Structures are given as C-alpha cells and as structure tokens.
Design an enzyme around this catalytic site. Sequence first.
Site, PDB file in Angstrom:
ATOM      1  CB  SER A  63      -0.963   0.008   1.194  1.00 36.19           C
ATOM      2  OG  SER A  63      -2.044  -0.890   0.957  1.00 36.19           O
ATOM      3  CE  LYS A  66      -4.557   1.919  -0.874  1.00 36.92           C
ATOM      4  NZ  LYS A  66      -3.902   0.616  -0.603  1.00 36.92           N
ATOM      5  CE1 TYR A 149      -5.134   2.944   3.195  1.00 33.99           C
ATOM      6  CE2 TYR A 149      -5.602   0.626   2.932  1.00 33.99           C
ATOM      7  CZ  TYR A 149      -4.753   1.695   2.790  1.00 33.99           C
ATOM      8  OH  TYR A 149      -3.546   1.465   2.188  1.00 33.99           O
ATOM      9  CD  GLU A 271      -3.200   7.065   5.925  1.00 31.55           C
ATOM     10  OE1 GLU A 271      -2.915   6.840   7.116  1.00 31.55           O
ATOM     11  OE2 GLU A 271      -3.680   6.205   5.150  1.00 31.55           O
ATOM     12  CE  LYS A 312      -1.314   4.077   2.593  1.00 36.27           C
ATOM     13  NZ  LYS A 312      -1.383   2.919   3.551  1.00 36.27           N
ATOM     14  CB  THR A 313       1.544   1.284   6.884  1.00 34.52           C
ATOM     15  OG1 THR A 313       0.136   1.488   6.685  1.00 34.52           O
ATOM     16  CG2 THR A 313       1.952   1.947   8.173  1.00 34.52           C
ATOM     17  N   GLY A 314       2.544  -0.090   4.289  1.00 36.69           N
ATOM     18  CA  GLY A 314       2.108  -0.976   3.226  1.00 36.69           C
ATOM     19  C   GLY A 314       2.538  -2.411   3.429  1.00 36.69           C
ATOM     20  CB  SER A 315       1.381  -5.358   4.460  1.00 38.96           C
ATOM     21  OG  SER A 315       1.731  -4.593   5.601  1.00 38.96           O
TER      22      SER A 315
END
Length: 357
Positions: A63, A66, A149, A271, A312-315
């Site tokens: 993510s 994004k 989300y 964010e 921003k986090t993402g996995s």
Amino acid sequence: PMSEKQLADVVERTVTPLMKAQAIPGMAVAVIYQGQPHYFTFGKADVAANKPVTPQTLFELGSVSKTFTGVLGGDAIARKEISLADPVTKYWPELTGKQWQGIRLLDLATYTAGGLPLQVPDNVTDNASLLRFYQSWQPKWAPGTTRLYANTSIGLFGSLAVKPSGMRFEQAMAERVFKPLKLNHTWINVPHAEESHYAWGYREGKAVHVSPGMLDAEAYGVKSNVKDMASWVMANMAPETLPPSTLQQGIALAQSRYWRVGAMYQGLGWEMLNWPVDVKTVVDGSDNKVALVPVAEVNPPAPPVKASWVHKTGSTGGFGSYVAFIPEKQIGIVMLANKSYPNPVRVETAYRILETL
Ligand SMILES: *C(=O)N1C[C@H](NOS(=O)(=O)O)CC[C@H]1C(N)=O
C-alpha cells in the site's frame, strides 16, 4: 549531529532484535538526514538461495504504492486533465446507477465514497466483471461523510485519473513520476532482467510474491529498492528543490489535507499528522479500521503543512514496508522488510530512530 558510525549503531541496535523477534529474514533501511541518504541492510533477500539484502534488493511496497498513485493523480490535476470535484461518471459514464450520481473523484481518492470494500474480489478478472462489481455496490453512507480505507476506492481513482491522458496507468506512472525523479529501479512489473534483485517475501515460512489482480498497480503493486525509495522520500519531503513542473505541483496536492479523522489528515495516498506529535498518537492515527468511521471535511483543502508527520504503511502477503518524514525537520526514513509485521511496530521503530536525530 550524529556521526555515520553513531547512526549505524542506532539502526543496528534496534533492527537486529526486531528482526529476530519477528522472524523477518531481511530488511533495508534508509535514513534521510542532513540532506543525505544513509543505507543499512540486514539479513537475507532469499533465504533458500542464501542471498543477502543489498541496496539493490527489490521489495514489494504494498500500500505504500498509494503514495505514487496520489502524486500521479495530483500531477493530472496540475495538468488540468482532471478535477477532484468532477463526478466519477464524467470518467466512467457506463457507471449509471443512482448510487453513483453524487460521488466525485475526490471520494474515490480519499476513501469517502460511502463504503467501497477493501479488496477487488479475486474472481473479478476483466473489465466487464469490474463494471458489474461497481454497478452492484450499495453504499452504507452518503458520500464525503465517512472513511473506509479501500483498494477499490483509490484503485479506481488511479485508473480514472489517467483516462484523459490515454495512457495505461503503468505507462503514465513511468513517464510522469518514475522517469522525472530518476527512479530507474522502481517497477510495477519487474522486468525479466531485474528478477535477480527481487526479494522473496515470507508468510508462515513460505516464499511468496504478490498475486496479480485488477487495480493492483494503483493500490499495492509497486516494487522498489531502498535507494529509489530514499529518493522518493527526499522528493516528497523537499519538493522545493525540484524544478518547477506539474509533478512538483502534484506532490503538493498529494500532501494537502482533505479530511480529518481524529488526529490524522487524509492526503492523496499520503497521510499526515500535525507535528509535534507523540508516538502513541501516530500509532492510533494510522489504524485503518475494518469498520467505517465519520470524517471532518477540510474545505477548501489545506495546502501542505511543513510541521507534519507524513507517512504511509504498506504490506503484501510476504512484505512489510513503511515510509515517514517530517518536512519541518528535514528527516525521514524508509523501512523495507520481506515479512509482514505489525504496523504499530513499524511506527514505533521509525519514531524511535528519528527521535535520535
Ligand atoms: C496495503 O498494503 N494494503 C491494503 C490495506 N492496507 O492497510 S495498511 O496500510 O494499514 O496496511 C490492507 C493490507 C494491504 C493489502 N492486503 O492490500
């Protein structure tokens, strides 16, 4: 200021027991400090092949993709190709249902359409099926009033945002974002010639790569190495050092504040929280709940605030990534891992490292 040896000690002392406790095989970390990137690599990119992580190792960003989508959308706004106030139906007129009449590109971009679900179903594999999916969707709340989300939301935003350009999303991203920023090792599809750099991700001890899906490029499909991701953080933290362009304008649009939920502000992909902020507030403000929550509107959108924590986090199934920076202080961090581990732990680890600067 901290010496390179002192900073390396800070990063090693935190990352080493983290990787052991979480069973993370490999990690690449970049710290942005005094205008410079600082790279630290740990462990294995490919456990079975005994291949170490290097600054050239490609990780799945999930993510964090994004943030690229948000900036590409902002670039399209600056090119006057789209407006966030435009109805979704302007760009997909075949979406004729009454539930779509009041929904805007803004709502897709920032998860406020009224309950679009987290994932495109895996059995949706062509355009006809994608159309039936969005046609069938029933909102739970009026648009512009709630946040949920959702890859189906910003993913569709990314797809519609490039429509006036005639380009496929991947083409537009490479031409308008990757190439101008010299992100020459950042990929939506990893070329055959670059596969030797592609780390395996690990889920329950099994090597996995992200599965193809509709709207994947827009929502979770970018792969990159720690050097390109440091450059990405630097471009978003200090865009005033770039030459004037629609891309520079788009970076500003993506860090503008469109909605507030508690202490978090929603940008385009990015964010933000007002700086200074305690770590517990950042953790609380970066949980994307399974349930819908109300939002507070920022009208007109507020321009980027230098006193922000931007992140921003993402996995993916096998990877966990995190990026964060504070423009007022000109510090930032990239953490790429080939095992998914809890988002609050990523925040805590990053916050503690940045605090030492
Ligand atoms: C992004 O990586 N994804 C969509 C959603 N993200 O929430 S998160 O950023 O707090 O990780 C859930 C996980 C992931 C996905 N499986 O698509």
